[PDB]
Design a protein around this motif. Sequence first.
Motif, mmCIF file in Angstrom:
data_model
loop_
_atom_site.group_PDB
_atom_site.id
_atom_site.type_symbol
_atom_site.label_atom_id
_atom_site.label_comp_id
_atom_site.label_asym_id
_atom_site.label_seq_id
_atom_site.Cartn_x
_atom_site.Cartn_y
_atom_site.Cartn_z
ATOM 1 N N UNK A 255 -21.018 0.945 27.987
ATOM 2 C CA UNK A 255 -21.746 -0.338 27.537
ATOM 3 C C UNK A 255 -23.069 0.214 26.571
ATOM 4 N N UNK B 57 -33.740 -12.146 31.962
ATOM 5 C CA UNK B 57 -32.791 -13.183 32.598
ATOM 6 C C UNK B 57 -33.457 -14.466 33.029
ATOM 7 N N UNK B 58 -34.507 -14.182 33.742
ATOM 8 C CA UNK B 58 -35.060 -15.522 34.369
ATOM 9 C C UNK B 58 -35.598 -16.441 33.165
ATOM 10 N N UNK B 59 -35.701 -16.007 31.935
ATOM 11 C CA UNK B 59 -36.279 -16.817 30.984
ATOM 12 C C UNK B 59 -35.100 -17.637 30.341
ATOM 13 N N UNK B 60 -35.549 -18.485 29.217
ATOM 14 C CA UNK B 60 -34.420 -19.454 28.486
ATOM 15 C C UNK B 60 -33.750 -18.662 27.372
ATOM 16 N N UNK B 61 -34.176 -17.350 27.157
ATOM 17 C CA UNK B 61 -33.464 -16.682 26.117
ATOM 18 C C UNK B 61 -32.170 -16.002 26.710
ATOM 19 N N UNK C 6 -28.016 -11.512 26.101
ATOM 20 C CA UNK C 6 -26.699 -11.184 25.314
ATOM 21 C C UNK C 6 -26.911 -10.585 23.934
ATOM 22 N N UNK C 7 -26.289 -9.212 23.716
ATOM 23 C CA UNK C 7 -26.058 -8.690 22.392
ATOM 24 C C UNK C 7 -24.776 -7.781 22.389
ATOM 25 N N UNK C 8 -24.474 -7.212 21.322
ATOM 26 C CA UNK C 8 -23.338 -6.459 20.980
ATOM 27 C C UNK C 8 -23.150 -5.643 21.995
ATOM 28 N N UNK D 46 -32.022 -26.078 25.016
ATOM 29 C CA UNK D 46 -32.878 -25.026 25.884
ATOM 30 C C UNK D 46 -32.263 -25.218 27.520
ATOM 31 N N UNK D 47 -31.438 -24.046 27.876
ATOM 32 C CA UNK D 47 -30.934 -24.276 29.056
ATOM 33 C C UNK D 47 -31.612 -23.275 30.126
ATOM 34 N N UNK D 48 -31.995 -23.596 31.357
ATOM 35 C CA UNK D 48 -32.716 -22.583 32.231
ATOM 36 C C UNK D 48 -31.586 -21.673 32.597
ATOM 37 N N UNK D 49 -32.135 -20.705 33.254
ATOM 38 C CA UNK D 49 -31.092 -19.587 33.823
ATOM 39 C C UNK D 49 -30.487 -20.162 34.920
ATOM 40 N N UNK E 182 -24.882 -22.089 27.515
ATOM 41 C CA UNK E 182 -25.334 -21.143 26.475
ATOM 42 C C UNK E 182 -23.984 -20.970 25.559
ATOM 43 N N UNK F 203 -16.978 -14.994 23.591
ATOM 44 C CA UNK F 203 -17.558 -15.003 25.040
ATOM 45 C C UNK F 203 -16.961 -15.934 25.944
ATOM 46 N N UNK G 138 -17.354 -9.165 25.963
ATOM 47 C CA UNK G 138 -18.673 -9.345 25.978
ATOM 48 C C UNK G 138 -19.448 -8.352 25.036
ATOM 49 N N UNK G 139 -19.133 -7.193 24.867
ATOM 50 C CA UNK G 139 -19.917 -6.373 23.913
ATOM 51 C C UNK G 139 -19.215 -6.122 22.611
ATOM 52 N N UNK G 140 -18.009 -5.431 22.626
ATOM 53 C CA UNK G 140 -17.412 -5.167 21.206
ATOM 54 C C UNK G 140 -16.604 -6.111 20.498
ATOM 55 N N UNK G 141 -15.969 -7.127 21.401
ATOM 56 C CA UNK G 141 -15.151 -8.136 20.959
ATOM 57 C C UNK G 141 -15.991 -9.078 20.138
#
Lengths: 68, 63, 349, 344, 331
Positions: free
Chosen positions: C327, C340-344, C347-349, D10-13, D19, D26, D111-114
């Motif tokens: 990873x 995690x518990x925010x609205x952001x 996820x990234x590469x 905006x979507x809450x967790x 999202x 994804x 998730x990561x490299x694709x």
Amino acid sequence: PKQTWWGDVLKGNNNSEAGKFVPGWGTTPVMAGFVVMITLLLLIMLQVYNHTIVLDGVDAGWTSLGGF
Amino acid sequence: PDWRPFAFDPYNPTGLVTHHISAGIALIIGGIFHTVSRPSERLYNALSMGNVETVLSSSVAFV
Amino acid sequence: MQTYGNQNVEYGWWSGNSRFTDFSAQFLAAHIGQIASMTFFAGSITLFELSRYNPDIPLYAQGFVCLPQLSRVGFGVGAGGAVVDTYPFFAVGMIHLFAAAVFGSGAIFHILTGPKVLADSDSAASQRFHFEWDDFETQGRILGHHLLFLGSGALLFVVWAATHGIYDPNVGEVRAVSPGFDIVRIFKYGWATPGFNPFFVDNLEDVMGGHLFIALIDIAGGIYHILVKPWPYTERIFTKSGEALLGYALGGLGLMGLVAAYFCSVNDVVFPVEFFGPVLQPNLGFLPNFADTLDVSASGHTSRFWIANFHYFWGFYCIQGHLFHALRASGFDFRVLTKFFTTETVELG
Amino acid sequence: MQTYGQTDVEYGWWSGNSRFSDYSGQFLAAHNGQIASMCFWAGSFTLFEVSRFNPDLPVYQQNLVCIPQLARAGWGVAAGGAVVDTYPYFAIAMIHLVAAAILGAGALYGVTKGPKVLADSEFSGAQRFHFEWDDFETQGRILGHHLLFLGAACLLFATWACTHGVYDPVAGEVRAISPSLNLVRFFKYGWATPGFNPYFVNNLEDVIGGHFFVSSLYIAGGIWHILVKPWPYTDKIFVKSGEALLAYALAGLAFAGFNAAYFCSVNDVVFPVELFGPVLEAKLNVTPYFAETLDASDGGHTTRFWISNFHYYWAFYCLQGHLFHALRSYGFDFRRIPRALASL
Amino acid sequence: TSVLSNFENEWWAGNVRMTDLSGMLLGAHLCHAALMSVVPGAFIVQEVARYQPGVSLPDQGMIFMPHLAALGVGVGAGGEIVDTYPFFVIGVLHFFIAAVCCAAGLFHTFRGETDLNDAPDDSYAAAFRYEWDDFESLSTIVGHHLVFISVACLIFAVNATYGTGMYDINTDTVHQISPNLNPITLIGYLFGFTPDGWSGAGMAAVNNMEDVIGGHFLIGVIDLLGAAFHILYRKPTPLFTKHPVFSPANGGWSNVGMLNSELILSWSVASVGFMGISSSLFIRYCDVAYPPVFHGVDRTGAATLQLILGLVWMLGGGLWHGLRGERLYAA
Ligand code: CL7
Ligand SMILES: CC1=C(/C=C/C(C)=C/C=C/C(C)=C/C=C/C=C(C)/C=C/C=C(C)/C=C/C2=C[C@H](C)[C@H](O)CC2(C)C)C(C)(C)C[C@@H](O)C1
Ligand SMILES: CC1=C(/C=C/C(C)=C/C=C/C(C)=C/C=C/C=C(C)/C=C/C=C(C)/C=C/C2=C[C@H](C)[C@H](O)CC2(C)C)C(C)(C)C[C@@H](O)C1
Ligand SMILES: CC1=C(/C=C/C(C)=C/C=C/C(C)=C/C=C/C=C(C)/C=C/C=C(C)/C=C/C2=C[C@H](C)[C@H](O)CC2(C)C)C(C)(C)C[C@@H](O)C1
């Protein structure tokens, strides 16, 4: 005038719509029917308790405890 | 609980449960309505719903 | 290493071993030291077990991991799994300790010999050993040499079983074993067709044939990797970084650890009953266990129990470490988890 | 997703998956993860049940779901519905765990490299697989391929039943079953004519003939959808968004689940008694449930009970989700519920 | 919204807001039918769950099983319930019907166009445009609904006569009974002219299945003819137009023959209340259609329940909506 957390939670229920009413009669007609309805219900119960009304197979007395 | 008419016999305990279920639901609906619905000007002015003393009067009568 | 974006990252001492990921000499030193530690464990534990050996108590009842392994491969075991002469174990442990001292000396030598990087050293022949975390040709040659060593080891096992003999619980005494060779039966063990299941090998002849095959395969692969550069598609698929190669190796090791853990609990031939104890049974509650299949009352646990459970855990956590390193090497930074518990989006590469 | 008018939602967790609804890579990754988890459950609980199994007690009264189904397909039961050996169960579970690991690897890769968006991938073999929620032409071929896999699995089950043989409760052992197949018979079952109630099949020959017919249907449909575009009227009829296809799929799953739950409850040829237990009776109160014909005291509940009761509610709440997502795809805003009361 | 009494826009009256919204109104009726069809199936399944074989139906307190057993469903000779599965099938099929109706109601409330006057100009849906003023539009609705009711009645009669018949009270078991088709004899019951003399309860003194089945054939044919009449003509006639009505719209009788939404609703409600009272008489006396093998002998309670409902609909609802419609005829 402390600005507590619980006060923040509950102030909307306390007095957000304080002193507000809809004009005219609104739902008052409907309420009327409900009252009359319960006025029968209670009445019926009274007579059933009073043995004025005798429902079929419903012996309003100590004998009805049979089955326990 | 049984909703057949003999549950209105006051000496048969099956009524009590049948009451507290149905009446319970009736209060919940009755709660929800009053949690949303506003009073009516007519009743609001007649019963003086802005004054807690009317609540005292009605509650004492009920009790 | 990884160093997401920002280079020249500062590592605390808890993660301080990532500091020398770019110093080839220090890399060599660290790994020679680690191998020294492994062989030192082998020898010292052999002696530590010999000190408290009881001939009266059955071997597996007492807590051992080395006496059963030595007794399995010849080395002073009589008929019916009897430890007749306890000197060869001493000799084996002593040779292991001497080897450990040699390796540790080499480790300190490289940690202090010259420059941190093997490119700058003016040896002009140590520069033949400087590698890169991007060049797949050099790493292919390295892989080839190490495979050569592994194949040579498998060959040595084949020879020692052919000449010195080796224990055979089915026979009941140390006995020379003919090296089989049947590619058909090797592949039938590969498929696990109903007759042949890989984890229920019954004849040491089949084991010896498979080992001969493994030696041949490893030597051939080593030659091939030394001679031949990796193909382009292997550059397309795999990332070229140190942590990526660590991830690949970790995944492989986790698989091998799980395989060995299952092997211990089930096979009775290559893990004879008289030495390691009766076979285990795999249980699955919350997490997999190996039940002893024997009353632990007044007998503790058999050595097979300890080996199997320890290596299940080693394999599982090597898999988890492989996931962590893959990873990272692919590009995922775990700091984003804090969002995690925010609205952001987490996820990234 | 719906996103009524508004953009940059905006979507809450607690509602987080929405999202990634607009990224295809994804999306693929998430669904690889889901099927990986399903396979993992299968293998893991095969092992779990085997670990908590007594060859002495009745199979059905022991809380089991994987051993009885594996037995029903052979693999460890000789005669009289008693599990003799356990190792093939272990082998099947191990294969399932390995497949789960592979699929989860695919997911983690995605998730990561694709590529986050398949169309934006440089590979241009990946750009083949990109799709858009409004294009029924591509989704037709996706549907066709998935139908092909379904039909292939059904045909494989048929052939395994024919050649290797499955349990036969009428016969009492594992039998190789020849397919008793006739179209008139299957239309009799479809119309529920008095001698043919499809939930009360009596001969597994008819079951396997039906499976051959169903496999042929699925393969035909898969080829048809790979080759034939959806018709223009489909644009008039259906909606074009991901949530809409989710609603259709939820409806189909609810239908399938209701059929499966009822099947388990009433049939006793497909589900032999010695494995799954006695037949159940449907019972309605405030909410429906299936109850045991035999006494449930001293025996907990039979496998049949658990399977049918669980899947009834799976199907019911899948239907509720179908309604929810259908209304969402219709543009109906549920923010109207806590708003209407405010106005009144 | 097409009304201005005093309280048109009150939430507790909010259904009046769909007075002109044809699509929403159609959806609302479909959802209501979903309710009406959920109840029977659900309660039949619940009943069959607790059914006991030894005891007879009247002593088990079942209020949907008797009507099904009256049609030969799951009963044999002697009028005892043998098999319970067909009741379960009936319940399940009502579930299916309810689900389809609810799907339609959800479609027309949300996805479908709210007002069919906004339909895209002959898009298979302008054919369903109706207006509470034009007579021609509503005529075809009445005609088609009559088609459906007539087909139902004819199906019932045909089943009774040819296929598997009904549980005939006198013959003691399920039989394909030979219908009686003496039209004067059948229509005599409407005035109480039963063969055994005039009877107080009209249509309810039938003493044989043949009379009822013949009456059903007659009703089916009549309703089919009326369906043809309304579908094929759609034009007002001097019966509806130019008939006497007494209303304060114009104090005293007038021959206007007015038409309005509340008026149509009122006539329908009065019709339903009347059917309720007729059914009250029927279940009170007619025990050919209600074999006391199933419904019990004493049946005053059910008849009284029907009576109360019929009075509430015929008097209460009918009067309320008729008065509102006549007052709205001041436009
Ligand atoms: C129950 C009826 C129902 C069904 C069966 C159903 N949905 Mg939904 N559904 C979706 C997919 C879906 C799929 C693929 C699917 C098919 O199986 C279904 N659904 C089916 C998503 C596209 C979309 C958003 C899905 C979405 O984001 O779901 C997440 C929801 C929940 C409850 C997770 C909580 C569950 C665990 C108990 C708690 C986990 C805590 C955690 C352990 C601690 C931290 C760990 C970490 C630190 C490591 C969706 C919705 C949503 C709703 C609602 C009400 C539903 N649904 C309902 C249903 C949204 O609000 C919501 C919506 O759209 O509002 C905007
Ligand atoms: C597929 C793919 C990948 C995956 C690549 C991987 C990880 C592939 C995995 C490869 C594996 C798991 C290979 C394993 C090979 C196992 C071998 C070769 C086993 C050899 C065992 C032998 C020879 C046993 C021998 C005996 C030994 C013993 C005594 C037995 O009693 C009998 C006897 C004699 C047979 C990625 C993810 C890296 C990149 C993707 O894009 C593509
Ligand atoms: C009309 C309409 C629509 C349609 C809406 C619906 C409801 C569509 C529904 C479609 C359904 C529910 C189709 C169901 C089909 C069921 C089938 C085909 C049953 C098949 C069983 C087969 C083929 C064999 C089964 C066996 C095989 C098995 C192995 C056993 O041996 C038993 C035995 C022999 C019964 C839309 C969606 C298009 C548009 C809407 O707006 C309105
Ligand atoms: C239009 C009009 C108005 C209204 C007038 C009214 C009230 C008119 C009433 C109209 C009615 C009530 C018509 C209904 C007629 C009923 C009929 C025709 C019933 C027929 C049923 C038959 C033939 C069934 C017979 C059997 C069938 C049945 C199945 C049983 O086996 C019993 C058995 C065999 C008798 C006003 C009030 C507005 C003004 C008036 O001046 C004129």
